[PDB]
Design a protein around this ligand. Structure first.
Ligand SMILES: NC(=O)C1=CN([C@@H]2O[C@H](COP(=O)(O)OP(=O)(O)OC[C@H]3O[C@@H](n4cnc5c(N)ncnc54)[C@H](O)[C@@H]3O)[C@@H](O)[C@H]2O)C=CC1
Ligand SMILES: NC(=O)C1=CN([C@@H]2O[C@H](COP(=O)(O)OP(=O)(O)OC[C@H]3O[C@@H](n4cnc5c(N)ncnc54)[C@H](O)[C@@H]3O)[C@@H](O)[C@H]2O)C=CC1
Lengths: 289, 289
């Protein structure tokens, strides 16, 4: 029985969904971690069957979601919750949404898991360029998009089985400059990739757990659409579809099937790596046009 | 009907064999390309059942070998083979072993294939360090170990279906220095890796075909043993098992399962990449003890 917790899903148009979809093809139980502010709305859409078609698997089956829990990557433990949030309308009717709390919650209800997916990003000033990003906004991007991975590993390793696997999503902006990806997001991804290597060492040596990161190509999702700089995401997609070695549309399931492989034992020898799933765009220097 | 041609197998102790074994789990037909000098010995052992145990695939499956053909990567076409090798004791009783001839041969007997594996390397002066390698020895290593890939692509591309996949094997000595990996082999691996990217562009744009390379960890194979440096290989294996993030023996089938994934459609969005399957050793800078 393989159980996978996916941190970072707010709809069916992101990478988290493509990953859950592909893992279902392999019969793995899925648990969603939903950011509190969109939890109730997500449950409403779910309950009203708005995701039904999106849950049908190729092999003529239904995606099996074990559970859906409110989850906020910016809070490590219960005593980290501040006043302003502890009174927020969207957080009031919710409890146990901190990293340690969800880990205890999952362990208590379903036992130990063996697959972990970090699929979340957030930066307050993603619209501003690096030079004009404030210290507060910069640290916010790193806390939510980078440190969250470290904390997830620290708390979930206690409820994971040996030889389990972890993955996260990153973007090439960390290695090469892409104008438009601001707010410290490029910085956060750079830390994520570096941290993945160091975590691979500690997790590998002490628990025999693997951890890799997938560098994906452009995907018109909510997080992306909110980067605007006809917006940043529309440009990257068009560019990728014109100049990438492989001229085909990049689907969330393309990252999903690769994630599925990295999360399985088929890849027991791969760890601390940044795997590119972008139709090869990253190998290009000079375009044809 | 998936058909894969594996170029570079002289026994069951190499990566070519582990790859063949893993591909058989997915029921893909295997065609072996055997270097002429060792063709007779290999057929002899196979015939006398000296590989029957190695052909056992976990699930009691029996490795499915479609065909076994003599093959020499140093010759592009029939009129490339010199008089000497032509009348050589080991080549006399054989024919159609050049790159162009095996392609036409496979096509004529089985039609188009969709999987190509370049699993060979060779260097006359591997025992010498770069500084002391002659021009002749250097060009020989590149000719046999690097150009062979480009040539294989040129002739096999015509007998491959769209969306097919190609992989080769490389070693980290191309990116970082490992004393002992001489004769221009480090050079050859560097070329192969760069060529993999360039070919991904061409193969991808014109044939919608993918090509990637696997950077494997140390394996005590025949080619590896030739690198007399208690030999280079024993050191590398011992060093990998004591310092890699994942302390475990690296099996040929570990590279095999990754090869299998890259050759299947599950990796449609990956191309031109160098994927490390080395228990994570490449991410380390300073060893522990
Ligand atoms: N869309 C793209 O073009 C690319 C995306 N990526 C990465 O893929 C990952 C997922 O992003 P997408 O599928 O693009 O977008 P997405 O918008 O579907 O997913 C991001 C999720 O993070 C959640 N989030 C924000 N702050 C949170 C917090 N404090 N706690 C928990 N959840 C929180 C949101 O609810 C959202 O569902 C991100 O890490 C992103 O950087 C990597 C390459 C490209
Ligand atoms: N063993 C190791 O530690 C590592 C090996 N590699 C690569 O893996 C690939 C396969 O090597 P191994 O499994 O190590 O050794 P192997 O010695 O079993 O296989 C190489 C094969 O190439 C064939 N060969 C040599 N010249 C040829 C020619 N002109 N035409 C056709 N075949 C020819 C040999 O018969 C041999 O079977 C090589 O490209 C090697 O560089 C990459 C990382 C590590």
């Amino acid at each position: 029985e393989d159980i996978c917790f996916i941190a970072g899903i707010g709809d069916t148009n992101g990478y988290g969904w493509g990953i859950a979809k592909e893992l279902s093809k392999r019969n793995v139980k899925i648990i969603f971690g939903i950011w509190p502010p969109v939890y109730n709305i997500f449950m409403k859409n779910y309950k009203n069957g708005k995701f039904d078609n999106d849950m049908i698997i190729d092999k003529d089956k239904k995606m099996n979601i074990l559970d859906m829990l409110p989850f906020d990557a910016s809070f490590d433990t219960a005593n980290d919750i501040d006043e302003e949030t502890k009174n927020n309308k969207r957080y009031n009717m919710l409890q146990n949404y901190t990293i340690e709390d969800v880990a205890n919650l999952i362990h208590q209800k379903y036992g130990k898991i063996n697959m972990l997916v970090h699929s979340l990003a957030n930066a307050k000033e993603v619209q501003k360029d690096l030079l004009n990003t404030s210290r507060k906004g910069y640290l916010d991007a790193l806390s939510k998009s980078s440190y969250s991975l470290i904390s997830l590993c620290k708390y979930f390793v206690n409820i994971m089985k040996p030889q389990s696997s972890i993955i996260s999503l990153t973007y090439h902006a960390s290695q090469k400059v892409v104008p438009g990806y601001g707010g410290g997001m490029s910085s956060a991804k750079a830390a994520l990739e570096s941290d993945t290597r160091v975590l691979a060492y500690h997790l590998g040596r002490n628990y025999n757990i693997r951890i890799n990161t997938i560098s994906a190509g452009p995907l018109k999702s909510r997080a992306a659409t909110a980067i605007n700089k006809y917006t940043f995401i529309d440009y990257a997609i068009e560019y990728s579809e014109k100049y990438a070695p492989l001229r085909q549309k990049l689907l969330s399931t393309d990252i999903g099937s690769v994630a599925s492989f990295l999360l399985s034992r088929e890849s027991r020898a791969i760890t601390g790596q940044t795997i590119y799933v972008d139709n090869g765009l990253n190998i290009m220097f000079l375009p044809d046009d």
